[PDB]
């Protein structure tokens, strides 16, 4: 997994190589600016030191002295007239050089990652459909955003700072060795340790922003799986249990957070302990080297400052090589996708294009297996012919040969043996595209793309006129209801717009198939999922669509298949028998068995929120001042050591004053290491118990909130797991971090302003003019070096919608072959923020260049007027060092501090969300404890006139006056048409909502006065596709009854009546077998039996069976019906019914339509009624 460096630079034209060449040279001559800045600082401090020693020698020089000493400063006043020119030359050079290095690398990266991103979406959309099912689609989408964003970060900007920092290294040691080699080697003895501390500090500085959620990822997985499965976790109880389990995963993430923050502040503590120890070593040794008359103070500042910025420039270059290595590892599988290759190329123009095709269609001896598992054989020796205009319907045992025929006719896969022909010509010698345009597909579940109706007709064929769209919609029997919706064709559909029903989406999918005008029509289970009222109009539209077209239909419930020309039956991938309906009736084969089976801060509130661990805060405040105290203290002792070398004292008192100041550097180092070791410990631990307690309170709060709150489109699962995870770690910064900021800065700058005004006030006013822009330089440089000021990832979230849409709906976007239109839309949505990023690449280059240039110009302007003050004797040089080091270096420190800490806008909007959510009071309070709670177990249920509206769409009504009685032990099944409200009765009887009017009675008593946990304790729900949790078998079945000790033995009884015990007894690791993505994948029937067992552990007196069409399993269909029949024998049971075999034996069945019950009676009595029951039973009679 490693691209070579030259193979990575494959998408650069002739221009971008010139950009990175000129930006490389600009990196080289930008990196060498700062060490020669330390050179010029060395010469000027030799100017001031020599003139200060000469004038301070002869102050005993009366008579006349008014022009002697003033002339002794006429030395130093015309000499800095040219060092002001050197400083403004380095500044005016580093302005354009710093400009051209940063903007050129960002621009080369913008063009490269524009082409890599666009062509990577090309090469994903040009990939075969068998490769699609091997590789998980969500991970491929996350690869599309993440992996290209990673090669973006590695390719452009970090490897400009790499050459900058390495040129700073080699230039720093070249001028270090050419000024003085002795002290260069003395620092070079300890420079591995300095370089290592610098490297670890830079690496924890860079990010520092992304690797913070790995400890949380386990508990975040727990919270995600329970919020994804809300309607079974607030349904079975276990709010307390899953709350305990998330708490238990949460405390470990708290512990790893503690270890993270304490190791981060150890790693900063060794950094400042080593710069303030190397200050002591090099001013100690440089002192005992300039006291011998061997160096000068300008050499010691030059060679020491430049060598030490060199050693720290290494570690400044440390994370860039690893970001390049991560970029190269990402580019191995991006480049490995975009190189090569499909065998069936949907873009090529190679094969023939025969016109006026009639559709004589042939399968000959085809043998095929899916590429995910070669070992099972799906189709063996299959032979078919269907000639033009004829209709073949293919039926048999499900899962074998039905849908693979329609997936081979589109040439989605190549068969291993045999040949498939169209019109006598082999399909693998014709072009793939022209193949896919002459065939129209109608899938089982219809998909709509998030744009207008007419824009979905554009995807069918792009050059269609609006009149032809109107005729195609009229032919698809969709015109009258589409004229009735509020906006018009321009109505927005998708996940953002209004939600159409399944038959509606399906017949406009028919309208796409009709606008393509195909000669061959393929229908794969077009009406298995649809109810009895919409299937008539859909079957009318499909019977209109079949006129004049060769048709292949794969479908269950073969009611109208009789009219089709020939029926073909499958067994083991082989069609055993073929003919018209009546021949398959006389044969008494598979088909006759199927027909007889058929028939706002408020900031003080956040400190009040964190008003439990006040002792931490108190020690934190007392420790933060000590940080702010030691930043001017460095400028004080620094200007006292260079202030003791610009006077003329005794050699022994200069030796012992400099030993005092060197030791005091080391004391500053120790009392720095302790003070933000434990400052990081106390604000880190107070903020992390704040975020653990705040996560636990917000999650306990969210498990209480009703189903009404989860239906809110502002409250999908990504918004709540992302909101919880982000807005609990932010609010740590809203209180705990800001007091460290304000007290560090107020001691830092406050003390610097005060001591600087005491020692000389004019120069402090001048530097006070400079003090905003150089602190801006601190914050802008720290936002540059953290990687924060370049990435935003909120301008590409308008272009990730279409990419995500095209990856997830890839079967449809292949079967109508609109890879090209999606490449176009993604290309333009990529090109607008491309243009913006091209403009921003100049603005950030000029603000970084400009404000660095303000630092260099700031040296110039400070020391010129400093020379003028010193010249008229109304200051000294240690005072321009004290007020310059205090105001300026304090300004850099308040920039670095005020940027290294977290934000404050995101922190306060986060705390507005958290304290806006944790004090929310639910309507139907679940964690309450009042209620009647009787010991009755009869359970005669009675709905009386229930009126309900779903709160996500309160305009449309669903239930109006629904009344029905359910006696003890009997069975009521409920059926009806679409939009009736039949799925709502489970949610109303379980009291997810209360009705507006009417009443719900359990056992003569209104539910609204009973306790909700007891009510849900005596109800056993069995959902349609059962949700299984990520744990073993015994917990998933034992999850049924909580607040109980449940015995292991008790699991076995429920598994017996759920008919899995005999099947489990052959499974590996019978009862502690883990289930999920890693363990065995069970079929939908076996999982359905597991949900039956989970409902059977409770032994409830009411059983709610929520089951739906259709079951293709044919090996567990009968055992799930056996387990359901064993469960319903002596229990009051309400079933939402779609299988017609369960309803004959029910004691009563209820047909609901538009919230109204039409009629009642037994099955055969309502059959003799000759109404809706007899109509629904009469549909499958065909």
């Amino acid at each position: 997994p490693a691209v070579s460096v030259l193979t990575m630079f494959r998408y650069a034209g002739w221009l971008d190589r010139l950009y990175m060449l000129v930006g490389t040279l600009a990196a080289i001559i930008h990196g060498v600016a700062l060490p020669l800045m330390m050179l010029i600082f060395g010469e000027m401090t030799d100017i001031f030191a020599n003139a200060g020693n000469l004038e301070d020698l002869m102050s005993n020089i009366t008579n006349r002295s008014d022009i002697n000493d003033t002339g002794f400063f006429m030395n130093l006043e015309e000499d800095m007239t040219t060092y002001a020119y050197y400083y403004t030359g380095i500044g005016a050079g580093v302005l354009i050089v710093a400009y051209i290095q940063v903007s050129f690398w960002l621009l080369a990266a913008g063009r490269q990652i524009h082409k890599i991103r666009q062509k990577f979406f090309h090469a994903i959309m040009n990939q075969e459909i068998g490769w699609f099912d091997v590789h998980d689609v969500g991970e491929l989408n996350t690869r599309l955003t993440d992996d290209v964003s990673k090669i973006n970060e590695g390719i452009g900007d970090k490897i400009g700072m790499f050459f900058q920092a390495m040129a700073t290294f080699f230039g720093g040691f070249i001028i270090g060795f050419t000024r003085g080699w002795k002290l260069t080697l003395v620092i070079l003895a300890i420079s591995p340790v300095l370089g290592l501390s610098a490297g670890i500090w830079a690496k924890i500085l860079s990010s520092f922003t992304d690797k913070e959620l790995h400890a949380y990822a386990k508990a975040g997985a727990v919270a995600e799986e329970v919020l994804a499965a809300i309607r079974t976790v607030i349904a079975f109880g276990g709010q307390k249990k899953e709350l305990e389990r998330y708490n238990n995963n949460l405390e470990e993430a708290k512990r790893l957070g503690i270890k993270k923050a304490i190791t981060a502040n150890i790693s900063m503590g060794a950094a400042f302990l080593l710069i303030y120890a190397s200050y002591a070593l090099a001013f100690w040794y440089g002192t005992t080297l300039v006291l011998s008359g061997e160096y000068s103070i300008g050499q010691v500042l030059t060679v020491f400052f430049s060598v030490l910025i060199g050693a720290f420039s290494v570690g400044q270059a440390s994370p860039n090589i690893e970001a390049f290595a991560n970029a190269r590892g990402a580019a191995y599988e991006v480049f490995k996708i975009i190189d090569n290759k499909p065998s069936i190329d949907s873009f090529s123009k190679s094969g023939h294009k025969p016109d006026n095709i009639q559709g004589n269609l042939e399968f000959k001896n085809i043998h095929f297996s899916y590429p995910s598992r070669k070992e099972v054989q799906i189709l063996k020796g299959l032979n078919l012919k269907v000639k033009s205009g004829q209709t073949v319907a293919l039926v048999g045992n499900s899962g074998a040969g039905k849908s693979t025929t329609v997936q081979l006719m589109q040439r989605l896969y190549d068969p291993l043996d045999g040949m498939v022909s169209i019109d006598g010509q082999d399909i693998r010698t014709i072009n793939v595209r022209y193949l896919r345009e002459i065939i129209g597909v109608v899938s089982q579940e219809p998909v709509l793309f998030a744009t207008t109706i007419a824009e979905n007709i554009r995807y069918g064929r792009e050059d269609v006129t609006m009149d032809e769209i109107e005729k195609a919609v009229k032919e698809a029997n969709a015109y009258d209801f589409i004229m009735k919706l509020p906006h018009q064709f321009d109505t927005l559909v998708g996940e953002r717009g209004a939600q159409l029903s399944g038959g509606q989406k399906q017949r406009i999918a028919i309208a796409r198939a009709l606008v393509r005008n195909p000669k061959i029509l393929l229908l794969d289970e077009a009406t298995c999922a649809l109810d009895t009222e919409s299937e008539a109009v859909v079957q009318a539209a499909l019977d209109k669509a079949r006129e004049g077209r060769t048709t292949i239909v794969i479908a269950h419930r073969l009611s109208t298949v009789r009219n089709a020309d020939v029926i073909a039956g499958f067994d083991g991938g082989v069609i055993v028998e073929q003919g018209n309906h009546d021949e398959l009736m006389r044969e008494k084969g598979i088909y006759f068995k199927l027909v007889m089976t058929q028939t706002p801060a408020s900031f003080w509130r956040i400190l009040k929120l964190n008003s439990t661990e006040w002792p931490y805060f108190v020690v934190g405040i007392f420790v933060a001042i000590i940080n702010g105290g030691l930043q001017p203290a460095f400028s004080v002792i620094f200007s006292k050591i260079i202030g003791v070398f610009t006077r003329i004292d005794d050699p022994e008192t200069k030796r012992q004053n400099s030993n005092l100041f060197s030791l005091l550097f080391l004391i500053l180092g120790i009392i720095s290491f302790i003070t933000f070791f434990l400052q990081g410990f106390t604000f880190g631990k107070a903020g992390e118990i704040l975020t653990k307690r705040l996560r636990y309170m917000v999650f306990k709060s969210m498990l209480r909130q009703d189903v009404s709150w989860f239906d809110d489109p502002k409250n999908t699962t990504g918004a709540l797991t992302t909101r919880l995870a982000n807005d609990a770690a932010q609010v740590k910064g809203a209180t705990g971090s800001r007091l460290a900021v304000i007290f560090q800065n107020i001691a830092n700058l406050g003390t610097g302003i005060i001591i600087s005004f005491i020692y000389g006030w004019q120069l402090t006013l001048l530097l006070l003019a400079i003090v905003p822009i150089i602190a801006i330089a601190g914050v802008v440089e720290m936002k540059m070096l953290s990687g924060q000021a370049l990435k935003d990832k909120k301008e590409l979230e308008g272009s990730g919608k279409i990419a995500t849409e095209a990856i997830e709906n890839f079967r449809t976007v292949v079967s109508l072959t609109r890879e090209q239109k999606f490449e176009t839309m993604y290309a333009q949505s990529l090109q607008i923020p491309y243009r913006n990023a091209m403009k921003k690449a100049h603005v950030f280059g000029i603000t970084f260049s400009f404000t660095q240039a303000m630092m260099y110009f700031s040296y110039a302007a400070a020391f010129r007027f400093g020379a003028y003050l010193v010249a008229h004797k109304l200051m000294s040089f240690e005072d321009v060092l004290l007020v310059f080091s205090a105001i300026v270096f304090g300004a850099m420190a308040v920039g670095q501090v005020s940027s290294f800490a977290p934000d404050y806008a995101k922190a306060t909007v986060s705390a507005s969300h958290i304290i806006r959510i944790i004090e929310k009071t639910p309507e139907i309070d679940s964690y309450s404890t009042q209620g009647l709670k009787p010991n009755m177990l009869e359970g005669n249920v009675q709905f009386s006139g229930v009126v309900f509206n779903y709160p996500t769409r309160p305009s449309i009504p669903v239930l109006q006056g629904l009344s029905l009685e359910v006696k003890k032990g009997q069975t009521l099944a409920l059926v009806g048409s679409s939009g009736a409200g039949k799925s709502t009765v489970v949610q109303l009887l379980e009291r997810f909502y209360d009705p507006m009017a009417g009443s719900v009675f359990l056992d003569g008593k209104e539910i609204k006065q009973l306790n909700v946990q007891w009510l849900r304790a005596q109800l056993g729900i069995v959902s349609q596709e059962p949700i299984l949790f990520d744990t073993s078998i015994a917990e998933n079945i034992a999850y049924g009854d909580n607040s109980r000790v449940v015995s292991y033995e008790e699991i076995v009884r429920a598994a017996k009546e759920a008919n899995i015990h005999q099947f489990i007894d052959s499974l590996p690791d019978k009862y502690n077998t883990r289930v999920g993505d890693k363990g065995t994948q069970l079929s939908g029937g076996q999982k359905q039996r597991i949900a039956i067992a989970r409902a059977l552990v409770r032994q409830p007196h009411i059983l709610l069976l929520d089951e739906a069409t259709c079951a293709l399993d044919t090996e567990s269909e009968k055992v799930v019906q056996e387990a359901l029949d064993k469960a319903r024998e002596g229990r009051t049971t309400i079933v939402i019914a779609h299988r017609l075999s369960t309803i004959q034996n029910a004691d009563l069945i209820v047909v609901i339509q538009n919230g109204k019950v039409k009629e009642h009676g037994t099955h055969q009595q309502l059959l003799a009624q000759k109404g809706i029951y007899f109509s629904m039973v009469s549909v499958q009679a065909g």
Partner: antibody
Amino acid sequence: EVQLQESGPELVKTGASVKISCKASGYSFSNYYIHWVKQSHGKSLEWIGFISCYNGATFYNQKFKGKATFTVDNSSSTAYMKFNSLTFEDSAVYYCARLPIQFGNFYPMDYWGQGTTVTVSS
Amino acid sequence: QVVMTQSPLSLPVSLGDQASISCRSSQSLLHSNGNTYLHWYLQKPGQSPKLLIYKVSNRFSGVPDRFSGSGSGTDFTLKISRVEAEDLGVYFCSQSTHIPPWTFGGGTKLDIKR
């Protein structure tokens, strides 16, 4: 090894100038003041003046002001004085001493040239 | 301009014993720091003058233990303890602690005591 060697004896006629040199070798030349001191025959060591030797910032004694002029040469690391408008009272032995600039007045003139005798005649 | 009266004028030392040379200033050589700055130099004829003692009691890097000085205020003394035949030159006492003249002492030869 620290050595200040000086030029050879001079025999200059009255009135013309003479330029006398103190070549330094073995140390960091750019620090020490170079003091020029005068010794007559059998008298105390008179003090002529000094140079800052970093930038040539002179300071003359009040007696030897104008009729002595100091200068340096950084590249060859030498000091010089042109001692113009001679008289008979300027035939003497001239020395050069080095003083550390970092602490002058508080430290002895520790290394010395061997002395160049200037004999002024007519 | 403190005028130093270095009192010896010529000093007849014999060989292998101690002889003291006196330097008497005409102003108190006691600076504001509690340090007395006068310095003692050796000078042989033809060669350069060597620094010998500094700040009346200290000693310079490379000179043997025969040379030690004492005294304070305006009375100063260097001690030629156990004289060899190698140190026979003219000795003189720098400096004025009050600059700028850097007033030197006159001089003191040595001898053999025939």
